């Protein structure tokens, strides 16, 4: 059972200050779970501070007082740069884990973590690196986003060893420092965003399985917009074909879509891309649908806004989705004022089905509707109340405090305050509405969230941030009372 269960705080740790001699200065900027372990293996994450990579294993415990977190490796970057970015790859010959770390010097350091060794360095960027992402379709392909305003795509495959830069995303798509890069599941589309307030989608060509003397240069994104947000953008992800992004000063994570974009369609080529012909258009797209009453059809649709209060003027704060077949998709993000927020996306759909049914029943039976919790069948509740009364099955998680109940003690419907509270959390009808978190957990101290990670099976969520602190939330625990 327990598919509806959301996480709770289980463990926290403070890793020693490692930057005060080189604002309070120490931060965990990144955390990433190793994704290539066999099903069921204990989950492993790397947390990246300005100077160290802290590699931890999580094991579920029966003892509430026991420590599920063990630190199995600790690497110091003994150079003179601050790091802020990581991703995982694998050695193409040994299949051993590779941890990629980058920061303000502008090189990607690739570490053999099990042996505690530098495997190689990726050199080429002209400024600091702010983000790294590994391709889901190919674990040897890594994208880096930089202050040089470009994205470089690298291959760790042996055939590209002499010249590991396979692609540069350049031209004039971006004009300022990049903060975020993300791959589509198919490995052929890349999202990028930063200080210029532009979110770009790029289509990558197939990279040959041989030595490339030069990278393939892409001059134009296939979709471009500075219109979704009104501020710098510091975190971009795909959610299937949909897009999630956040900007500074807004207190939201925006779910939106590119009109006409489907990853089932063939991958467009470089010369299908639009070009900025009119400097007054702040959105352009190859994907645009041809049928609309507007002369220039809408190129994107804002779908929903997750409310993320009290981020203030803070930026460099990233959210993360747990998205695995057979489990509920969960969004997690920590703000700049000591809270962690969770949304279970599968609640939306059940709530929607429940209010459609409740609305139908109210119209058909003149408000004579009795709701009964799921977990008594529909058929047998209908016998009990008779054929004059509508019966609606309500999800068990949907807990009380479409028209409201006539009076407080009526047997039909719910109070206005019940309905409002539910709507705040679950109603998706307003693209510029604010969706309250399904769960909001307080953090002791003053904590700014930098990054969130989920274990492969979704039982752990690790949030990292300032003061080199890590917060480890759990669900489906084995703890005995």
């Amino acid at each position: 059972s327990a598919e509806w269960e959301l996480p709770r705080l289980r463990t926290s740790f403070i890793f020693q200050d490692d930057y005060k001699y080189l604002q309070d200065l120490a931060e965990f900027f990144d955390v990433k779970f190793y994704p290539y372990s066999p099903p069921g293996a204990p989950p492993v994450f790397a947390a990246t501070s300005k100077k160290h990579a802290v590699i931890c294993r999580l094991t579920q415990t029966t003892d509430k007082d026991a420590n599920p977190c063990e630190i199995i490796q600790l690497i110091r970057d003994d150079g003179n740069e601050a790091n802020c970015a990581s991703c995982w790859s694998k050695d193409p010959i040994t299949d051993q884990p590779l941890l990629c770390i980058a920061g303000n010097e502008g090189n990607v350091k690739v570490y053999n973590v099990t042996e505690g060794k530098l495997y190689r360095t990726l050199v080429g960027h002209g400024g600091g690196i702010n983000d790294l992402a590994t391709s889901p379709a190919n674990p040897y392909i890594i994208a880096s986003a930089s202050d040089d305003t470009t994205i470089r795509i690298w291959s760790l495959a042996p055939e590209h060893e002499k010249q590991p830069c396979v692609c540069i995303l350049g031209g004039e798509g971006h004009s300022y420092d990049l903060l975020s890069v993300a791959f589509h599941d198919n490995g052929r589309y890349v999202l990028s965003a930063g200080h210029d307030q532009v979110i770009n989608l790029w289509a990558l060509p197939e990279f040959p399985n041989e030595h490339m003397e030069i990278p393939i240069v892409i001059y134009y994104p296939h979709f471009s917009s500075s219109e979704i947000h009104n501020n710098l953008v510091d975190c971009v992800a795909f959610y299937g074909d949909l897009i999630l992004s956040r900007a500074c000063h807004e207190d939201t994570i925006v779910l939106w879509r590119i009109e006409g974009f489907s990853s089932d369609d063939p991958i467009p080529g470089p010369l299908d891309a639009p070009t900025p012909t009119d400097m007054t258009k702040q959105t352009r797209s190859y994907f645009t649908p041809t049928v609309s009453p507007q002369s220039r059809p809408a190129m994107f649709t804002r779908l929903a806004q997750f409310h993320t209060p009290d981020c203030g003027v803070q930026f460099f704060m990233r959210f993360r989705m747990y998205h695995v077949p057979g489990k509920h998709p969960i969004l997690a993000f920590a703000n700049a004022k000591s809270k962690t927020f969770f949304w279970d996306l599968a609640r939306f759909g059940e709530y929607a089905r429940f209010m459609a049914d409740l609305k139908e029943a109210q119209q058909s039976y003149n408000g004579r509707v009795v709701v009964v919790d799921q977990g008594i069948s529909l058929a047998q509740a209908q016998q009990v109340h008779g054929p004059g009364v509508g019966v609606v099955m309500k999800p068990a998680w949907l807990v009380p405090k479409v028209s409201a109940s006539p009076d407080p003690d009526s047997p039909f419907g719910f109070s206005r305050e019940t309905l409002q509270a539910w709507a705040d959390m679950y109603d998706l009808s307003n693209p510029v509405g604010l969706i309250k978190a399904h769960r909001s957990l307080a953090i002791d101290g003053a904590f700014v969230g930098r990054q969130v990670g989920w274990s492969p099976e979704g039982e752990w969520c690790v949030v990292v941030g300032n003061g080199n602190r890590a917060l480890i939330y759990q669900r489906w625990g084995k703890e005995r009372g």
């Binding site: 931060e27 710098l232 930026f315 700014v448 941030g465 003061g467």
Partner: peptide, 8 residues
């Protein structure tokens, strides 16, 4: 007014 990357 101005955006900030570091913790307050």
């Amino acid at each position: 007014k101005a955006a900030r990357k570091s913790a307050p």
